[PDB]
Ligand binder design. Structure first.
Ligand SMILES: O=C(O)CCNc1cc(Nc2ccc3[nH]c(=O)[nH]c3c2)c(Cl)cc1[N+](=O)[O-]
Length: 131
């Protein structure tokens, strides 16, 4: 699937961006070219620094710091919920946010810590609606 757009009339591929993420998530599943371990409450999550930086203000700041960009292990605040992190990491790699009544507060807190503004705002709206 392709279509035209812009004063260019440039060809755009509809599924290209989502296909790239699908493939990045496959690399993560197979531990191919992963270059960082994120440690949350003694659980370990392998990932790609570029994907993290593309989705999170916190990770953008870390991995653009000339000192911290060389670390292969990054520890998060030990009060961060690991399920909250796993939900957001999955979101980064898929566009899908598995928000539920039983996890929304943890996910929101985690998204605030990671500086994922669109997710925070979304959690706020869903909390607002249920009051
Ligand atoms: O059967 C295959 O081609 C292997 C399928 N698996 C796979 C494929 C890719 N990239 C890939 C490969 C060939 C392509 N030809 C294209 O036009 N685009 C392509 C993208 C990545 Cl990055 C991870 C995985 N993976 O880890 O599973």
């Amino acid at each position: 699937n392709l279509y035209f757009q812009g004063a260019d009339s440039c060809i755009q591929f509809t599924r290209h961006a989502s296909d790239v993420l699908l493939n990045l998530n496959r690399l993560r599943s197979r531990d191919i070219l992963t270059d960082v371990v994120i440690v949350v409450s003694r659980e370990q999550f392998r990932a790609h620094k570029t994907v993290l930086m593309a989705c999170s203000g916190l990770f953008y700041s870390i991995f653009t710091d000339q000192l911290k960009c060389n670390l292969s292990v990054i520890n998060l605040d030990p009060e961060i919920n690991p399920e909250g992190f796993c939900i957001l990491l999955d979101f980064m790699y898929t566009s899908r946010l598995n928000l539920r009544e039983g996890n929304i507060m943890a996910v929101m807190a985690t998204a605030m810590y990671l500086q994922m503004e669109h997710v925070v705002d979304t959690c706020r709206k869903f909390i607002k609606a249920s009051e």
